[PDB]
Design a protein around this nucleic acid. Structure first.
Ligand SMILES: [Mg+2]
Ligand SMILES: [Mg+2]
Ligand SMILES: [Mg+2]
Ligand SMILES: [Mg+2]
Ligand SMILES: [Mg+2]
Ligand SMILES: [Mg+2]
Ligand SMILES: [Mg+2]
Ligand SMILES: [Mg+2]
Ligand SMILES: [Mg+2]
Ligand SMILES: [Mg+2]
Ligand SMILES: [Mg+2]
Ligand SMILES: [Mg+2]
Ligand SMILES: [Mg+2]
Ligand SMILES: [Mg+2]
Ligand SMILES: [Mg+2]
Ligand SMILES: [Mg+2]
Ligand SMILES: [Mg+2]
Ligand SMILES: [Mg+2]
Ligand SMILES: [Mg+2]
Ligand SMILES: [Mg+2]
Ligand SMILES: [Mg+2]
Ligand SMILES: [Mg+2]
Ligand SMILES: [Mg+2]
Ligand SMILES: [Mg+2]
Ligand SMILES: [Mg+2]
Ligand SMILES: [Mg+2]
Ligand SMILES: [Mg+2]
Ligand SMILES: [Mg+2]
Ligand SMILES: [Mg+2]
Ligand SMILES: [Mg+2]
Ligand SMILES: [Mg+2]
Ligand SMILES: [Mg+2]
Ligand SMILES: [Mg+2]
Ligand SMILES: [Mg+2]
Ligand SMILES: [Mg+2]
Ligand SMILES: [Mg+2]
Ligand SMILES: [Mg+2]
Ligand SMILES: [Mg+2]
Ligand SMILES: [Mg+2]
Ligand SMILES: [Mg+2]
Ligand SMILES: [Mg+2]
Ligand SMILES: [Mg+2]
Ligand SMILES: [Mg+2]
Ligand SMILES: [Mg+2]
Ligand SMILES: [Mg+2]
Ligand SMILES: [Mg+2]
Ligand SMILES: [Mg+2]
Ligand SMILES: [Mg+2]
Ligand SMILES: [Mg+2]
Ligand SMILES: [Mg+2]
Ligand SMILES: [Mg+2]
Ligand SMILES: [Mg+2]
Ligand SMILES: [Mg+2]
Ligand SMILES: [Mg+2]
Ligand SMILES: [Mg+2]
Ligand SMILES: [Mg+2]
Ligand SMILES: [Mg+2]
Ligand SMILES: [Mg+2]
Ligand SMILES: [Mg+2]
Ligand SMILES: [Mg+2]
Ligand SMILES: [Mg+2]
Ligand SMILES: [Mg+2]
Ligand SMILES: [Mg+2]
Ligand SMILES: [Mg+2]
Ligand SMILES: [Mg+2]
Ligand SMILES: [Mg+2]
Ligand SMILES: [Mg+2]
Ligand SMILES: [Mg+2]
Ligand SMILES: [Mg+2]
Ligand SMILES: [Mg+2]
Ligand SMILES: [Mg+2]
Ligand SMILES: [Mg+2]
Ligand SMILES: [Mg+2]
Ligand SMILES: [Mg+2]
Ligand SMILES: [Mg+2]
Ligand SMILES: [Mg+2]
Ligand SMILES: [Mg+2]
Lengths: 44, 150, 117
RNA sequence: UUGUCGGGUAAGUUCCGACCUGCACGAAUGGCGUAACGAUGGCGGCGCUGUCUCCACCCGAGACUCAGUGAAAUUGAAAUCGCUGUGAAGAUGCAGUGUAUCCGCGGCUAGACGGAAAGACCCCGUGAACCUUUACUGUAGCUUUGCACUGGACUUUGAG
RNA sequence: UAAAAACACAGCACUCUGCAAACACGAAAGUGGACGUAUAGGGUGUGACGCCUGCCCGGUGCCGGAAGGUUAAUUGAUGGG
RNA sequence: AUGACGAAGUGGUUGAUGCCAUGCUUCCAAGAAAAGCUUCUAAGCUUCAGGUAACCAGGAACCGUACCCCAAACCGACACA
RNA sequence: GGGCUCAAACCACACACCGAAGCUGCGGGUGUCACGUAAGUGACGCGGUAGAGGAGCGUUCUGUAAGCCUGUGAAGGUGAGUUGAGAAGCUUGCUGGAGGUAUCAGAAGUGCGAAUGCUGACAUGAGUAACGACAAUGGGUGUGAAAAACACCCACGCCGAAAGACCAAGGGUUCCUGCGCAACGUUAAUCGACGCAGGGUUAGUCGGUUCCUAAGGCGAGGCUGAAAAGCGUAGUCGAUG
RNA sequence: ACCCACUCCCGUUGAAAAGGUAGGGGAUGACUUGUGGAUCGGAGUGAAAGGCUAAUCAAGCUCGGAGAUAGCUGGUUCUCC
RNA sequence: GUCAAGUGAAGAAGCGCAUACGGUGGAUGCCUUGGCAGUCAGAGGCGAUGAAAGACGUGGUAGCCUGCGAAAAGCUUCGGGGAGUCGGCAAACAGACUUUGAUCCGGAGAUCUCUGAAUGGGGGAACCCACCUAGGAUAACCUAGGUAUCUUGUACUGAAUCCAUAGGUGCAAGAGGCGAACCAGGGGAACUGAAACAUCUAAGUACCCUGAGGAAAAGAAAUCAACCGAGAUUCCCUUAGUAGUGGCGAGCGAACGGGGAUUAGCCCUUAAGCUUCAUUGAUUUUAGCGGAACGCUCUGGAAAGUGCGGCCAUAGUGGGUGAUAGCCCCGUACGCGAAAGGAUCUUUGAAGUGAAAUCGAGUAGGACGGAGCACGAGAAACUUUGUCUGAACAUGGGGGGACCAUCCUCCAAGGCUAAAUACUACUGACUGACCGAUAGUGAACCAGUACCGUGAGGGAAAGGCGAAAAGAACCCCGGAGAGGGGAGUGAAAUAGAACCUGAAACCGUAUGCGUACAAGCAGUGGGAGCCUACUUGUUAGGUGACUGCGUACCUUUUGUAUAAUGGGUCAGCGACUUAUAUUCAGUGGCAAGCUUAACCGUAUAGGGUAGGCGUAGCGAAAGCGAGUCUUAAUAGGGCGUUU
């Protein structure tokens, strides 16, 4: 049974990484929200 | 309370009691049902109601011998030892001193005394007139009391 | 401002469980089971203050019947005789005589027999 | 309506052929046929058989016992029998009566209206959603004309 | 929990579209259609093949016409204050 | 493990889905791009620079590299048929 | 129900008795009226859901309280006794080891058994089901506190287009050695993908990086859009090539 | 092989939140498959089942409006008169 | 003695109740490391001189936190300070430093890897690849600086195209990003309410976006008023839930006037201001210094508590110290203190700006369609503008809520302007009839962590030995275990590290009684026996044979043992609150009067009487008035008047 998580660190980086978030304005909002909450990890 | 936006599980089917938030006041760590906010507790007292209570207190203090009237009450230096000597001549230990004008030296001398309070006529609240064992009042403050309450 | 219920609640629950002493199983250990047992025992106790008076009178009357039939009278005829001859000894004392003082009980029965006829 | 007739069977509400009385077929929401094809629907046959008459024996794996580890749903509390009545109307618990020493283990599922999911059917709420339309009221879009951007000239066109 | 007789299909037909196409996504710019150009592209229905596909234009839609009636914004004659 | 020696080590046949082969034939549905590479010149450069060939000398940086990988180490909450 | 028939049935009459929380007796409490300017007497009352009215207990905090109690033992906990109509109060043994609070007021996060309530702990089921492919084990020896499972030896059995060997992805130290076994391992464990410590990965040629581009991304200016932005030219990235 | 999923049985607190054994279909194609990329919430994608869009679909998830509203169900805690 | 009949204890596999002692668990009490809410101040920003936020490093020894940055728990210097020190978890050994003044605290400097607006180019953040200049090495490099884009300005060049322009290159200045709220503006829902729903409401709210500042905005009448006058703006209280608005439904909701807080006006014949740089003095902030006064005695492990006797106080309800301390310590009142930096007021000076130039024309007005004004088209003034038009020039123009006339009042189409006002992510102090570990922050503890999720995001649990580790030397059993038994420490070890107290469920061991012919809410009434203890039987406690009666509780219902609902049990938590308006009652103050709001106030006082209610009603209203309204009516009748 193939499950939903098929890991690919390259795909993970390009969809959820720091530069993917910084590229847009809503992505920068995620980083602002996660900095304001104090998340130790900011992106993945 | 922090969080609690999401419904913890679907309304039907899980067998649990239905829950809308994990911050229900029913839940541990949830909201206080009727959480307090900073509020004011001061009642309104009519001006004449306040004065009538002061008149009752002053009349009762005279009837109970708890009012001591002296011609004047002044200390020379702001020394607590000096005030203790003065109040011991009058035989007073727990006493509220009421003067027409609170002396600067008198205020300093009574500041550290355990059961001694010095107040202006305007500062003589109903609570302090009742709490203190004796109310030593100068003749000037007696007359100033008469103008205010009569 | 904030009032903890622990001390007062423990005192309440302990009073109930102390009253449930001697009860079986959860009726002496578990508060919400012991609470029902203490209430029901109270309902019974109130009702059995009434029933005790009935039970003892039925016991006196049965012993008076047995004692009087040993003397040639039924209970109903003895009570009627004890009213014709104005004897106001009640059934508790009469049942005590019929067991413990049989000569005294015989004298009363003879006094009832004479009164009837 | 299992229409009627014929065939197939000892016997066929199914099947195949036919009749036409088509409740209520019918011609590109196609009509009628059709070789090949189909893990497609129906029916018949040969073979084959434990499908069955009717089950027997055997072989492994559980079940069972010992040693080690060690869940679950459920659960108001239980000292938790039958029957006939009664009863919020189908009783382990009420009444009467019968039976019945105390406690396991292997089995079986008749009941505990057994467990599981605040019935989905049904009705209700001046509940929801999504769907439809010649329901209402709107609206994107498409379209009509006026005015603006927007001008010159010549000609068919009313009154001053 | 449905693999089918459902969907698709080759073939068929109707209809739209002259290219800055119709049509679609986009407040728009632009993009697809298509670096295609009616033997092409879109939409609709039917569904190899064989024989065929009858009658009805009243209703609704669509197409064409414009004599008449009605009809928007607009304009503002006239009357009454 | 320890350190020296160490014989034979040749023919026949069979033979790939591997290589020739990015070949050949055939078909229709008509089958990446760019650079490296070769060559030609323009602007420039003209004793130069640059190019070519020979010889000599030297260099080739940085990151990964264990281990599992039809699995008990990955995706399945598990040392999960 | 047992049983019943000159009845223990039916009809009539009579005298007895039983029988309720009804009535009476005795003792107590309470409501309302009246007399009382009193303590109290008198009369009549006193089942109760929804609901109205009245009167209280207790808990935490503030004042009274720089008081009072308290290591000669506070709060809390756990027994006993006792008082009141009740919520409850008081005294005391033991435990506990530093706080508590009279009285009268004032403020409330003020009283829990239910909400398929929330959190934690612990039961019942029950020492029950299960111990995860039916490829399979037997013995000997060693070590060890202890061996069916660890190591070795002799046998047996299983896979072998894999259950063998690799590359990629993914993981990240699981690799090897010494020590170790609490927990982890569905049992035990001396063994381990487990714990502690140390060690181990060496490149001009392998794979990346670097060069080049595909889809696609971003995109100076630019065009468009209330804003945020959208699109896209020059370019610049982007392998799966 | 690989992809698939027609039948029975098992399993249904499973070895497994869809499997296994035995049979079954396609297996040069409208085939299967890796890597990378594009399209998404009244939106996408759909050989069309209202299918699929991270075990969630007649309008995903997440946070906010938000303590929506609930003429409905449940619950509502000491004492006495 | 035999037989027969009758009667019959004790012998419990297990179980029940009670009691005692444990176990599990972690309630309760007490406590605080941390929170919550205010009050008074401060600061109101940080960033291309590289921020917020991080990654990786940095120590004698592993990790993590804190600090710091290859100069890396730190370097230089100036002050404070005066004996210890080498940060914490969390110590152990090492090696050292320090009265040649260390550690520590404060000011100023230096260094400051890599990522991140990230800015040389690229990128999967913390990585990869460069170029230019200058210097120095001969090999395969090293040091220092520069190299983003856009805006503004400037210089040089420069097409189609002759002059130009567009463009290109250099230089200088600036910007970009982050931050809880407050402000201005652009876009703008729905649920909900209307007991349905569409106008309407929710609401110009939530949210998204932009810009600015410590505040912002507004602001000096083309404003109200009403024939009297007021005199910018902003904010508070009233007027008043009134006028009005509204499927005249649900709702929405002024102004005039009045009381206050603040007060300020200046220019376009160019100013008040504001900014920057000097500059004169005042404070203030960022380290610190001194700071009073107590003994004996009893209990006790320990005294601060008991008893007795003193002293200080401008310092007395602070925190600790072996129990409760004015006098033991640290502090407190009070008085001093700055080498250096920051800030705020000021006195002058300098430029810069305000600055739009020169009194306002595509403007006022108008038509259409919207929006706003409390005002939903209404009889609809006024503001504003998407489309379209379009004046006059103080002998003029705007407004006064359709509109006209008269009167009054103002001068739009140019600007700048403090205070009173809003907010608190941040820093300090003070405070609380706030919490006290299920509370209070989600977070008292290495918490936005673990963990869950692809991701956005969601999101825990977990505090306490003792006064002091004095943390149990040594002996014994045991596997050189785990765990115990002694010994010892300690006041106490059943305070032994999962450690204060130590509840309940739940699980045991011991003892007493009961229990194997017996039917059911498990009790209650009666009641034998046995056991225990003294009070020795009219007693207390435990058990309880046998027997009468007896179908839990909650909820919901006409009605429930119901086979209707809910609960496995325990412990903790868990539901009528609060604000603002208001009516009635009770209880007070004052009384034909009563009471203030904002606000002021060395501030619960006192002032403030604007306002509200009352003392008069009737009428739709003008109005009249102990009457009034209806009506022809002074008649009748309605309401009112005798408190
Ligand atoms: Mg909380
Ligand atoms: Mg006042
Ligand atoms: Mg037939
Ligand atoms: Mg037929
Ligand atoms: Mg048909
Ligand atoms: Mg036809
Ligand atoms: Mg057909
Ligand atoms: Mg097929
Ligand atoms: Mg077993
Ligand atoms: Mg029955
Ligand atoms: Mg069975
Ligand atoms: Mg059932
Ligand atoms: Mg239901
Ligand atoms: Mg199927
Ligand atoms: Mg069809
Ligand atoms: Mg290797
Ligand atoms: Mg799973
Ligand atoms: Mg296994
Ligand atoms: Mg597996
Ligand atoms: Mg009688
Ligand atoms: Mg009676
Ligand atoms: Mg009675
Ligand atoms: Mg009486
Ligand atoms: Mg009665
Ligand atoms: Mg009553
Ligand atoms: Mg307390
Ligand atoms: Mg409870
Ligand atoms: Mg209840
Ligand atoms: Mg069983
Ligand atoms: Mg079994
Ligand atoms: Mg078994
Ligand atoms: Mg196994
Ligand atoms: Mg062992
Ligand atoms: Mg393998
Ligand atoms: Mg290994
Ligand atoms: Mg084990
Ligand atoms: Mg290891
Ligand atoms: Mg782009
Ligand atoms: Mg741009
Ligand atoms: Mg490239
Ligand atoms: Mg590649
Ligand atoms: Mg086949
Ligand atoms: Mg359907
Ligand atoms: Mg799905
Ligand atoms: Mg929807
Ligand atoms: Mg709302
Ligand atoms: Mg709700
Ligand atoms: Mg036994
Ligand atoms: Mg860079
Ligand atoms: Mg970059
Ligand atoms: Mg030119
Ligand atoms: Mg900025
Ligand atoms: Mg509604
Ligand atoms: Mg600023
Ligand atoms: Mg301003
Ligand atoms: Mg005037
Ligand atoms: Mg001192
Ligand atoms: Mg102590
Ligand atoms: Mg002007
Ligand atoms: Mg205008
Ligand atoms: Mg105007
Ligand atoms: Mg007017
Ligand atoms: Mg002006
Ligand atoms: Mg907490
Ligand atoms: Mg606690
Ligand atoms: Mg000792
Ligand atoms: Mg303690
Ligand atoms: Mg303890
Ligand atoms: Mg017996
Ligand atoms: Mg029984
Ligand atoms: Mg009794
Ligand atoms: Mg009975
Ligand atoms: Mg019913
Ligand atoms: Mg009943
Ligand atoms: Mg029930
Ligand atoms: Mg039952
Ligand atoms: Mg239940």
């Amino acid at each position: 049974m193939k499950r939903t998580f098929q890991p690919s660190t390259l795909k993970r980086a390009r969809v959820h990484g720091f530069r993917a978030r910084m590229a847009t304005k809503n992505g920068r909002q995620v980083l602002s929200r996660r900095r304001a909450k104090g998340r130790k990890r900011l992106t993945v | 309370v922090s969080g609690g936006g999401k419904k913890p599980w679907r309304q039907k089917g899980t067998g649990r009691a239905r829950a809308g938030t994990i911050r229900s006041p029913i839940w541990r760590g949830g909201g206080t049902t009727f959480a307090a906010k900073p509020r004011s507790h001061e009642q309104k007292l009519n001006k004449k109601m306040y004065r009538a209570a002061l008149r009752s207190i002053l009349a009762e203090l005279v009837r109970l011998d708890r009012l001591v009237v002296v011609a004047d009450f002044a200390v020379d230096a702001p020394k607590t030892k000096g005030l203790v000597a003065k109040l011991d001549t009058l035989g007073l230990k727990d006493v509220l001193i009421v003067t027409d004008g609170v002396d600067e030296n008198l205020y300093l001398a009574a500041r550290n005394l355990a059961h001694v309070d010095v107040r202006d006529v305007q500062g003589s609240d109903p609570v302090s007139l009742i709490a203190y064992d004796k109310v030593l009042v100068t003749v000037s403050a007696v007359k100033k009391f008469e103008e205010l309450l009569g | 401002a904030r009032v903890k219920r622990g001390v007062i609640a423990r005192r309440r629950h302990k009073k109930i469980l102390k009253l449930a002493k001697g009860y079986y199983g959860a009726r002496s250990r578990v508060f919400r089971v012991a609470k029902q047992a203490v209430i029901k025992a109270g309902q019974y106790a109130y009702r059995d203050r009434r029933q005790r008076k009935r039970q003892f009178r039925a016991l006196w009357i049965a012993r008076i019947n047995a004692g009087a039939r040993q003397n040639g009278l039924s209970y109903s005829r003895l009570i009627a005789g004890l009213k014709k001859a104005a004897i106001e000894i009640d059934r508790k004392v009469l049942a005590d005589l019929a067991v413990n003082e049989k000569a005294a009980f015989t004298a009363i029965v003879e006094k009832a027999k004479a009164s009837l006829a």
